[PDB]
Enzyme design. Structure first.
Site, short mmCIF file in Angstrom:
data_model
loop_
_atom_site.label_atom_id
_atom_site.label_comp_id
_atom_site.label_asym_id
_atom_site.label_seq_id
_atom_site.Cartn_x
_atom_site.Cartn_y
_atom_site.Cartn_z
N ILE A 226 39.66 40.67 49.72
CA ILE A 226 40.26 41.75 50.49
C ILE A 226 39.25 42.86 50.72
CG2 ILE A 226 41.08 42.71 48.36
CD1 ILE A 226 43.07 44.22 49.72
N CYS B 263 53.27 26.94 44.49
CA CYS B 263 53.14 25.78 43.61
C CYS B 263 53.69 26.08 42.22
CB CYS B 263 51.69 25.28 43.54
SG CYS B 263 50.44 26.52 43.12
N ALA C 27 46.19 36.83 48.38
CA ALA C 27 45.36 35.63 48.33
C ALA C 27 44.01 35.90 48.97
CB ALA C 27 46.05 34.47 49.02
N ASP D 83 26.63 50.73 40.35
CA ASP D 83 26.59 49.27 40.34
C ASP D 83 25.42 48.82 41.20
OD1 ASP D 83 26.83 46.58 40.87
OD2 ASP D 83 29.03 46.57 40.76
ZN ZN Z 1 49.19 28.67 43.14
#
Ligand code: ZN
Lengths: 276, 54, 277, 54
Positions: free
Chosen positions: A245, A209, A242, A54
């Site tokens: 990382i 959410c 989230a 890469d």
């Molecule tokens: Zn969300």
């Protein structure tokens, strides 16, 4: 039922080569790293080399440390070595040419890294290009029938064919388009006589959410389908932490779930850790 | 022998039309196995065809 | 600053061929449909044809109705026709396969025109998930009585796809390094071919204003900032992430608008909840 | 003329090494323009090379 992880491989004693493909934004680069990291913790008395063609030097982005053309140990470990190189630069419209000479150059260049060194690499992991794997060269000599080349190819082909020596790990997400491609991949890989018995599925929400508890739906949907359709594969299911990382700590920390199947109920507290 | 060959193509042709008429997206598992099988028959055929070529 | 929408195109009065491509899971099929629907509503005295060679019949999926090999109208419209077909069904040189493939589609498109009696103004190509067979228009160069029979044809197509007024390519992508990287790779290719491309659609944006969204967004925004100073001369329409799948003429239409009147979360936030049911 | 040719390769070579040393991921805009430019020089060269071929 086939164990839903990569323990068998992460503890192999026959594997000299492990390719790791998958087109798409599939968290693959984190996958190659986890595997490399994990093998090296499970076999210290072995020397692992992880390479990338890469050309955006991802292996560097991932570790947050700057590798290069000469094998170099990861700051934090003593058997894992990243290498970032580019065959094209270092390097007749027949199908297979470019790919062969290229990869070929890679190998030549890996051995250089071993001789001039002194110490040597046990098991090497290939993190396939963002523009696909060059593995089409496997079928060069067939469409072939100058021999200085067809001769080298065979020598390797022989070795990539032995299922104890070499396997390919597929990376993917729980999504029609991705999976479709993943199967299409497995077909081609087998077109070659290449062992492939593992599939890493990244990014699953496990939302127990309101975009999450909806996107989860399709994930869970297609998950059910993977289940019906690759019984004979280990397919490790991976969590989605989230934000980005990266970092040998974090990397290490998350790489475990390729070993002991991530279980949201219980392995939960470890995903908040990496989310900070 | 050509009587086996013909027997196959019906299968291939019929299985194609069936797969053609299914939600590959809502029946992924099924759609694929059928595609695999579909590919399978393509190769069993040419092995035949080529015999007949003699 | 070129308008951040597709209004020039959705109202063009010269375009015969509009390709739409981009690899990955990039909400592209909804892009092909939105555009097609949008022209149909802005040029009724014109006939639009949206075709797909995707062997998994994504057009049917997206519309929730079952199209086929023969040009047919979308239930709910009278100038928008969908078609799903498979070239592969109907000399290992680079270019051949792709050329004949496409070639055959063209033939077959005309069939749907003559045998019918009514003809198509502007067709939109939803390019295959394995990507555009579009390499074929550099064949003349890198290139036997049947030989010219082809190259000649190819030149006649090329002649037409080369003209910036007649045919452009829309790129679909998401605000992510891997995709973005791949997109530019694409734009280069497209230009290597003397193919016009001056439009980029960026789907799945959160615009966030839980706690996993307000984190994934940062990256999106991050790369947004990059696109902005890297394609000044492109119309690059930025699009919202409706929660969950999004199919059915109604919905498809309701969403398609934001290619025309550029989306805007502060205001247009009300509409997106409408599709999230 | 070859004196212009050489002048270019330094540029190409030097620009490559520079781009090589940047976070393409953290400086995407810059990385790309540089790559474009990089590609640009590759083509200006061969136009040269081929002249010199005579
Ligand atoms: Zn969300």
């Amino acid at each position: 039922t086939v164990e839903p992880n990569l323990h068998s491989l992460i503890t192999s004693t026959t594997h000299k080569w492990i390719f790791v493909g998958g087109k798409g934004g599939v968290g693959k680069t984190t996958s190659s790293c986890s595997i490399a990291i994990q093998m090296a913790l499970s076999q210290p008395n072995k020397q692992f080399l992880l390479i990338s063609t890469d050309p955006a030097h991802n292996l560097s982005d991932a570790f947050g440390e700057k590798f290069g053309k000469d094998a170099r140990k990861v700051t934090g470990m003593n058997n894992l070595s990243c290498m970032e190189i580019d065959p094209s630069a270092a390097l007749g419209s027949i199908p297979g040419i470019d790919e062969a000479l290229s990869f070929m150059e890679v190998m030549k260049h890996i051995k250089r890294q071993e001789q001039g060194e002194g110490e040597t690499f046990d098991t090497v992991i290939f993190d396939t290009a963002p523009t696909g794997h060059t593995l089409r060269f496997l079928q060069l000599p067939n469409t072939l029938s100058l021999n200085e080349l067809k001769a080298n190819v065979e020598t390797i082909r022989q070795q990539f064919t032995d299922p104890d020596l070499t396997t390919f790990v597929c990376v993917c997400i729980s999504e029609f388009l991705s999976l479709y491609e993943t199967e299409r991949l497995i077909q081609e890989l087998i077109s070659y006589d290449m062992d492939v018995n593992s599939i890493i599925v990244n990014q699953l929400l496990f939302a127990e959410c309101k975009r999450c508890q909806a996107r989860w739906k399709m994930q869970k949907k297609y998950l059910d389908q993977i289940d019906e359709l690759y019984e004979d594969f280990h397919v490790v299911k991976m969590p989605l932490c989230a934000g980005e990382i990266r970092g040998l700590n974090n990397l290490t920390k998350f790489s475990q779930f390729l070993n002991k199947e991530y279980n949201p109920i219980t392995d939960g507290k470890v995903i908040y850790e990496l989310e900070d | 022998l050509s009587k086996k060959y013909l027997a196959k193509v019906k299968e291939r042709h019929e299985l194609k039309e069936f797969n053609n008429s299914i939600s590959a997206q809502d029946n992924y598992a099924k759609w694929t196995k059928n595609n695999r099988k579909l590919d399978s028959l393509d190769k069993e055929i040419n092995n035949l065809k080529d015999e007949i070529q003699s």
